[PDB]
Design a protein around this ligand. Structure first.
Ligand SMILES: [Cl-]
Ligand SMILES: [Mg+2]
Ligand SMILES: [Mg+2]
Length: 344
């Protein structure tokens, strides 16, 4: 059921943001703590829903994902002016959700009606270089629910990201995240087939003039996302990889290149059980717990891993106790069903 996968995708993103938010300033995270945290959500047997109903507040990740999906539903298509104004109005309505330090400048400029070019604020960020943050990717899952063709997913993931993220390191992260959700919607796959399809798309995109120039300017390997997708392949082939090795090779940072590949690794790794994560947890729950246990950008790596895992496993693996702990879970489910109705 594509409907189950749409609902699972947005629920998975919400879970990642809400559950991961508690650990977003830790840096290093004890898995013992994470397991206690998710256990506090489960009521006594015979009791429906959550022990902590809507107690977990979402952050900027969900606030922007909601605005992006509401824009797609309002216009039945990507509309840069509509989406930019929805981002700016959402920030204005609640500026304290936990936004990036830099991107708030973009919203303040978009709130000025003298600003007519909605892409101009993003271009001015960080001395005209653009943001390479993961804010374009944290919110992009909705693009892959609205556009079925892989060519449209790339085009509109890039344009939606460019409203805040003018660096190719920012917007190619958003494209990679959107492609992972797009692939997850196609259903059962080996890690190898999943990775090879992503590597195929990213090799082509990262050969573009802007992608080569931006990577060169930041002193990075040519085709940096492609290089990290290869590293994911190598890490999946190793018997046992420590969290320290995952973070050393892929990162757990606010940079899109240090978080989007990490999220994809978390999804692929957690297809298999882990001795440190009880078999009581399904694959979606294991992906979120493992993501958060990497520390660093815990709300954002988990929201991206959750979007992919949600699209792949669907609504059957979304636990009622976890979902109903999350602020606005019912609104999130209505948005998912609306995207399915409008676009599928
Ligand atoms: Cl690099
Ligand atoms: Mg956040
Ligand atoms: Mg974050």
């Amino acid at each position: 059921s594509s409907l189950s996968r749409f609902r699972g995708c947005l629920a998975g993103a919400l879970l990642g943001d809400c559950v991961g938010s508690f650990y977003a300033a830790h840096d290093t995270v004890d898995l013992t703590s994470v397991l206690r945290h998710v256990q506090s959500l489960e009521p006594d047997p015979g009791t429906p829903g959550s022990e902590r109903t809507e107690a977990l507040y979402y952050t900027d990740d969900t606030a922007m994902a909601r605005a992006l999906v509401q824009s797609l539903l309002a216009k039945e298509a990507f509309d840069e002016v509509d989406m930019a104004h929805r981002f700016a109005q959402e920030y204005k309505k609640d500026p304290d959700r936990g936004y990036g330090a830099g991107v708030v400048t973009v919203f303040k400029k978009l709130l000025n009606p003298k600003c007519r070019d909605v892409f101009e604020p993003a271009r001015a960020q960080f001395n005209g270089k653009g943001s390479y943050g993961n804010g374009g990717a944290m919110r992009v899952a909705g693009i892959s629910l609205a556009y079925s063709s892989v060519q449209d997913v790339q085009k509109f993931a890039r344009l939606s990201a460019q409203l805040t993220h003018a660096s190719s390191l920012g917007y190619n992260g958003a494209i990679l995240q959107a492609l992972a959700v797009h692939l997850a919607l196609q259903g059962e796959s080996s890690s190898e087939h999943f990775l090879k399809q992503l590597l195929g798309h990213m090799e082509d995109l990262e050969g573009d003039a802007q992608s080569v120039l931006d990577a060169r300017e930041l002193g990075m390997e040519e085709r940096p996302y492609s290089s990290r997708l290869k590293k994911i392949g190598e890490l999946l082939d190793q018997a046992s990889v420590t969290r320290e090795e995952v973070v050393s090779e892929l990162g757990n940072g606010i940079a899109a290149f240090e978080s989007v590949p990490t999220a994809i690794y978390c999804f692929l790794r957690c297809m298999e059980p882990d001795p440190e994560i009880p078999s009581a947890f399904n694959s979606l729950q294991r992906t979120l717990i493992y993501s958060i246990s990497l520390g660093g950008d815990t709300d954002t790596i988990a929201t991206m891993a959750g979007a992919i895992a949600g699209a792949y496993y669907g609504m059957d693996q979304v636990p009622e106790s976890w979902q109903q702990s999350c602020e606005g879970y019912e609104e999130t489910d209505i948005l998912a069903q609306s995207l399915h109705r409008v676009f599928q």
